[model samples]
Target: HHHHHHMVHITLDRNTANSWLIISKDRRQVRMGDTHQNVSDNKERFSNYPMVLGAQRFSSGKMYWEVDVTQKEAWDLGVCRDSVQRKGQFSLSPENGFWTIWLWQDSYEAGTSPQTTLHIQVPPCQIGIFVDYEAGVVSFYNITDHGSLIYTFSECVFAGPLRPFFNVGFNYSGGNAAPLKLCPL
Candidate 1:
């Protein structure tokens, strides 16, 4: 394939409780919508997950990805929900706390709605996830390439039963507006 860029707009079905769009480094983006219903346990939720568009898997290599949260408040961003057993048991670091890049299986409990929960504001930030699966670490990075410890769980893969999703895009949440673009280097 040519080392080029491709962009596509997608929409989340109103019926969908949550949806996601994944974008790879080569510019290929996938949009995944929600399938589960809202429960008292997991209610008002974001619509989808971030689509993985590139050919490469997340490893200890350097990369870049930008998210447009123009219409999204702190509540609209996606998060890796921890299990009920460990609820409120962990403390997030101040600097890298806003953007959650990895989900721990033991921690991957149930999904919750945005309404009945507390929201964290993610200032328009560029983020990165360096998965050193071999080293049993998944770290978060700020726009300037600073490392933020998200989770140190081992064997945490990139593909998801629980993944990241965005709300706005040209064809999806963006409507007639230009879609937000995320480029992963």
Candidate 2:
């Protein structure tokens, strides 16, 4: 495999996204589209999950990216194996090839087997994700709280290329309509 340069500019890949997501033309922001806008029902498109993968694939590197999750209550961020299930029912977890974390009903939960619920002093305005490919680790940081750590997934054992994962969860009581954006570095 070719070496990766640790490019920090991660953008959502619209071509591989489900029609339920509204990916910005700039390709750095995404949110649920109420109408499930028309798009090709390609094989790579997610049919079960309303999520998207980043345009860049990582083989090996240390990388970081910040996501602006302000005003959104239910959303997910992290990395997933390129072979993650796309057109079937599957929970977001390492076993299913995802190392994701999300906020639902004001609670933050890691995508573990039993799912670890995380607690933070303040709701996050922005979240920073760090991944060490060789070390097989992924960590989440609360950018609003002086970059304090929120959680970490250790001994990941990534088998193939890893794609950054994102989920702009459906609108719940109009509280999560805001777009999830890639923060300025």
lDDT, each prediction: 0.30, 0.86
The numbered model that scores best in lDDT is 2
Q: Which ten residues in a row have the lowest lDDT in candidate 2?
A: 1-10
Each candidate's clash count: 25, 0
State the TM-score for model 2. 0.94
Predicted structure 2: lDDT: 0.86
**Candidate 1 local lDDT, 1-185, one digit each (tens):** 11112211222223223333332333433233243233322333332332222223233332233444333322223322221011223232212122233222112211222212222233234434443324433343434333233223344433322223333322443332333345443
TM-score of each: 0.33, 0.94
Top candidate on TM-score is 2
Give the least accurate 10-residue stretch of model 1, judged by summed lDDT: 106-115
CA-only RMSD, every prediction: 12.0, 3.6
